[PDB]
Amino acid sequence: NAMLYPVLTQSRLLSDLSGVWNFKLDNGKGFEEKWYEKPLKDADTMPVPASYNDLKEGTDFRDHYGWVFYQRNISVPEYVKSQRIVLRCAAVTHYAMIYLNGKLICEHKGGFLPFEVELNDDLQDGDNLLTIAVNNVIDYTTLPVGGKSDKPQNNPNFDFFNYCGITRPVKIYTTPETYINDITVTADIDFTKEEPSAVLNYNVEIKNNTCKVELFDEEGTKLSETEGSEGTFEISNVRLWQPLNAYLYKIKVTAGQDVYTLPYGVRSVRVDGTKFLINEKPFYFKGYGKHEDTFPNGRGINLPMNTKDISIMKWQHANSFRTSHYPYSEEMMRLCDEEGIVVIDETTAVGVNLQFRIGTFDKEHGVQTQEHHKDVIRDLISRDKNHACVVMWSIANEPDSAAEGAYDYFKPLYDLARELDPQKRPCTLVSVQGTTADTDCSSQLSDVICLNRYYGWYFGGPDLEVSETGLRKELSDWGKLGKPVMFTEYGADTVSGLHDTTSVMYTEEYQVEYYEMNNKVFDEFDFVVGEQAWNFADFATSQSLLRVQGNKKGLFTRDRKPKMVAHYFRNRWSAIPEFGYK
Nearest distance, CB of residue 248 and a copy of itself, angstroms = 11
- Measured in whole angstroms, the distance separating CA 357 from the mean position of its chain's CA atoms is 32
Q: Which is nearer to a copy of itself, 46 or 417 (CB)?
A: 46
Sheet holding 281-282, edge to edge: 269-271, 276-278, 281-282
Find out whether the peptide bond into 296 is cis, omega within 30 degrees of 0.
yes
How far apart, in Å, are the Cα atoms of 547 and each of 63, 160, 326, 494?
17, 10, 21, 11
* Binding partner of residue 370 among a copy of itself, ligand I9G, none, CB cut-off 5 to 8 Å per kind: none
Q: Considering 292, 398, 474, 578, which one is annotated as catalytic?
A: 398
H/E run at residue 48: none
* Binding partner of residue 32 among a copy of itself, ligand I9G, none, CB cut-off 5 to 8 Å per kind: none
- Measured in whole angstroms, the distance separating CA 119 from the mean position of its chain's CA atoms is 29
267: Cβ–Cβ under 8 A, 6 or more apart, which residues? 187, 189, 240, 241, 242, 278, 279, 388
Contacts with a copy of itself by CB under 8 A lie at 8-20, 38-39, 41, 45-47, 50, 54-58, 73-80, 82-83, 125-127, 219-220, 295-297, 300, 303-308, 310-312, 314-315, 331, 334-335, 338-339, 497, 558-560
Q: Considering 489, 508, 531, 578, which one is annotated as catalytic?
A: 489
Nearest distance, CB of residue 289 and a copy of itself, angstroms = 21
Residue 377, phi then psi, degrees to nearest 5: -55, -35
Residue 228, phi then psi, degrees to nearest 5: 120, 170
Nearest distance, CB of residue 55 and ligand I9G, angstroms = 24
Q: Which of 464, 570, 451 is nearest to 511 (CA)?
A: 464
| DSSP 8-state code for residue 554 | -
Q: Which is nearer to ligand I9G, 64 or 453 (CB)?
A: 453
Q: Which is nearer to ligand I9G, 274 or 532 (CB)?
A: 532
Nearest distance, CB of residue 511 and ligand I9G, angstroms = 13
Question: Alpha helix (H) ranges present in 421-507?
Answer: 442-445, 464-479
Q: Which is nearer to ligand I9G, 124 or 549 (CB)?
A: 549
Nearest distance, CB of residue 127 and a copy of itself, angstroms = 7
Contacts with ligand I9G by CB under 6 A lie at 159, 325, 397-398, 432-434, 452, 458-459, 489, 534, 551, 553
Nearest distance, CB of residue 225 and a copy of itself, angstroms = 16
* Binding partner of residue 553 among a copy of itself, ligand I9G, none, CB cut-off 5 to 8 Å per kind: ligand I9G
* Binding partner of residue 405 among a copy of itself, ligand I9G, none, CB cut-off 5 to 8 Å per kind: none
Query: Cβ(267)–Cβ(283) under 8 Å?
Result: no
Residue 184, phi then psi, degrees to nearest 5: -165, 100
364 is catalytic: no
Q: Which residues pair with 567 in a beta bridge?
A: none
Q: Which is nearer to a copy of itself, 207 or 561 (CB)?
A: 561
37 is catalytic: no
* Binding partner of residue 116 among a copy of itself, ligand I9G, none, CB cut-off 5 to 8 Å per kind: none
Catalytic residues: 398, 489
